[PDB]
Amino acid sequence: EDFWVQYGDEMLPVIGDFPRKGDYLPSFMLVDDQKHDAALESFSHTPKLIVTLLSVDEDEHAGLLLLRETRRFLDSWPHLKLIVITVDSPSSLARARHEHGLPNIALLSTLRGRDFHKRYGVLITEYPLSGYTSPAIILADAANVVHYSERLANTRDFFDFDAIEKLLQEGEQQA
Amino acid sequence: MEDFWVQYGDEMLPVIGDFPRKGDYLPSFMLVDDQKHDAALESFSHTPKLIVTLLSVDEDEHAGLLLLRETRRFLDSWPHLKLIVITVDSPSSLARARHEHGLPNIALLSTLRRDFHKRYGVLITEYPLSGYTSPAIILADAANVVHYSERLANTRDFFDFDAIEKLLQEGEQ
């Protein structure tokens, strides 16, 4: 195994090649919360922050709390498009939007092709998280080149937002 | 050229695979329940069952919660029939729905691990329902033998409960 995520008392392999700094994002064919096809081209000419969560119906285990911390981080970086990807159905993603708002956040489901998981290095095949996307964050520029990527080693953890902030500040003070 | 179609609003979509018929044994499945536990046919031992595929527990009028509630209402007269609901929803969403919508006894199974979809003849591949389970109902006995099966032709329709009731009544007599 290349990677493990801790979920309560279980330690589960995470499978596939997770994108790294300097990589171009792998292509994807997903479906959004209104059942529309979503590809990288759907988010053209914008930098983005891609986040995989276990599901929008988890709370402490890589769910709505982590999403919330990520939204809060992005108060400082309004030009960064937040793209949330999960195994949830489009119908459930639409319900989450209705119930929680999630302004300007894209919500994408892997149901149209679950091979997204291996291609993005977030595939879990063991009980109890079999079929889920392991929680991860990827910062990419408008050319879809990766500047930062991290997979969580434990589902209760938060991403290293301080590390992402430092990269964004360093870029800004350059320009 | 298709064997079956489902109407979803103004969209008419092919449904793919071999749908179980009267006298068939249920095909095996390997699903995951709303508490993230493996669920196989043998998980529902010694019981007749009513298997329903819905689009999602988070749909309302389109083969979703309204159809689920009508199905459970119908089953109130048939205390031995276990209701098993299967969707593409996540276990996490199914668990939330159970609490949010008051569904204490139903088995709620996710297909997240489309092998099921095709083996049960409920697979949709076309926009905008690509990857969903087409809505359907299967009545099976404790031997897992099918007594009645129906795929909805339109997502806003109800199953033919009258036809199911008649078979169950003819059974009890």
Ligand SMILES: [Cl-]
């Ligand atoms: Cl119930």
